[PDB]
Paper text:
To understand this intriguing mechanism of cognate substrate rejection in NTD, we have solved high-resolution crystal structures of ApNTD, as well as NTD from Methanococcus jannaschii (MjNTD) in complex with non-cognate and cognate substrate analogues L-seryl-3′-aminoadenosine (L-Ser3AA) and L-threonyl-3′-aminoadenosine (L-[name]), respectively. In the case of MjNTD, L-Ser3AA and L-[name] complex were crystallized in C2 and P21 space groups with six and four monomers, respectively, in the asymmetric unit corresponding to three and two dimers. However, a clear and complete ligand density was observed in only chain A in the case of MjNTD co-crystals and therefore only this monomer was used for analysis. The possible reason for this could be the remarkably low binding affinity for the ligand in MjNTD, as revealed by binding studies later in this section. Second, and more importantly, just the presence or absence of the water Wat1 is not sufficient to determine whether the substrate would be deacylated by the enzyme or not, since Wat1 is also present in the MjNTD+L-[name] structure. There was a clear activity against L-Ser-(Ec)tRNAThr while no deacylation was observed against L-Thr-(Ec)tRNAThr even though Wat1 was present in both L-Ser3AA- and L-[name]-bound structures.
We have been interested in a D-aminoacyl-[name] deacylase (DTD) fold that is present across the domains of life in two different functional contexts: as an N-terminal editing domain (NTD) of archaeal [name], which specifically removes non-cognate L-serine mischarged on tRNAThr, and as a freestanding ‘chiral proofreading' enzyme, which removes D-amino acids from tRNAs in bacteria and eukaryotes. Here we show, with the help of structural, biochemical and biophysical studies from three distant organisms, that the substrate specificity in this domain is determined by a differential remodelling of the catalytic centre at the RNA–protein interface rather than just the presence or absence of catalytic water as previously proposed. While demonstrating that the [name] provides the catalytic group, we show that the side chains within the recognition site are dispensable for the proofreading function, suggesting a primordial mode of protein- or peptide scaffold-based enzymatic activity evolved alongside that of RNA.
Author numbering:
A (entry chain A), B (entry chain B): 5 to 142
């Protein structure tokens, strides 16, 4: 897995158009103030263990989010972070599990729609730990 | 080289803190509207031909800018896109070259300062061609 964590003043998104692999979603729009925007590409290597990958992901998000003491998390699918991607079915599963585990761990979570073209607005805080990239293993 | 090209309503930035390799500059604050925000990671392979990499990158930016009829370009150093980076000195050279060549080809260019932690704000348009990733080889 590849992840970009952006410590943000806000993140808003608006689904605009479906791709062929668009997911049913219960929020085509969303806004979250002061958050860790986690842009995630679920990778082919992640298919070896999708459940372990979601745990590995939450573990790393916690590591950074505890270091910033942020409780607000956006799970934002972002395929462009990798050139060797997982299947859409597996990616959706991992992203949904990440949201589930984080919610279970008392985090405030917003998940952007998988497989939709989305307008978005983000403001990065710009401190030395405000943009971090992480490679994640199960 | 890895680039992510985002068709944006705006890109704004504010350099906040220096790193070890912060470039010396006056342009520490900036904004461009209706722009192609080009997040660029210069890679180890690019060291073999820095000028050629720059020319290749400009060619791809032009293809997208011409397809979307965009004239405003932001050159944004973004190491996060790649796990196999060139040296810092190589990276700034190539980024500076991309900026100078785009300028000589008639584009309005703003380059975000290299080696500074920066706050930034962006708004992605969200149409199907608004977020494109490209590998550049030279
Ligand atoms: C394009 C860009 O602007 C947009 N933001 C986009 O990335 N769209 C992707 C992801 O939301 C999702 N998707 C498919 N596979 C994956 C994967 N392995 N990991 C994460 N997302 C995936 O499906 C869309 C088309 O590939
Ligand atoms: C901090 C982070 O969130 C910020 N946004 C950042 O990416 N900072 C990078 C670039 O500005 C630049 N830089 C150094 N090497 C490279 C490279 N190979 N390619 C591109 N830029 C580089 O130097 C910084 C640290 O590597």
């Amino acid at each position: 897995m590849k992840m970009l964590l952006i410590h943000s003043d806000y993140l808003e998104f608006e689904a605009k158009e479906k791709t062929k692999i668009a997911e049913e979603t219960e929020n085509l729009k969303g806004k979250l103030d002061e958050c860790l925007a986690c842009f995630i590409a679920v990778e082919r290597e992640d298919e070896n263990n999708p459940e372990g990958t979601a745990i590995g992901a939450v573990e790393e998000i916690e590591k950074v989010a505890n270091q910033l003491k942020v409780n607000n998390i956006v799970v934002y699918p972002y395929a462009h972070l990798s050139s060797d991607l997982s299947s859409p079915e597996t990616a959706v599963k991992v992203l949904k599990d990440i949201e589930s585990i984080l919610k279970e761990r008392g985090y405030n979570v917003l998940r952007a729609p998988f497989g939709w073209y989305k307008a978005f607005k983000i403001s990065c805080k710009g401190h030395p730990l405000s943009e971090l990239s992480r490679k994640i293993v199960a």
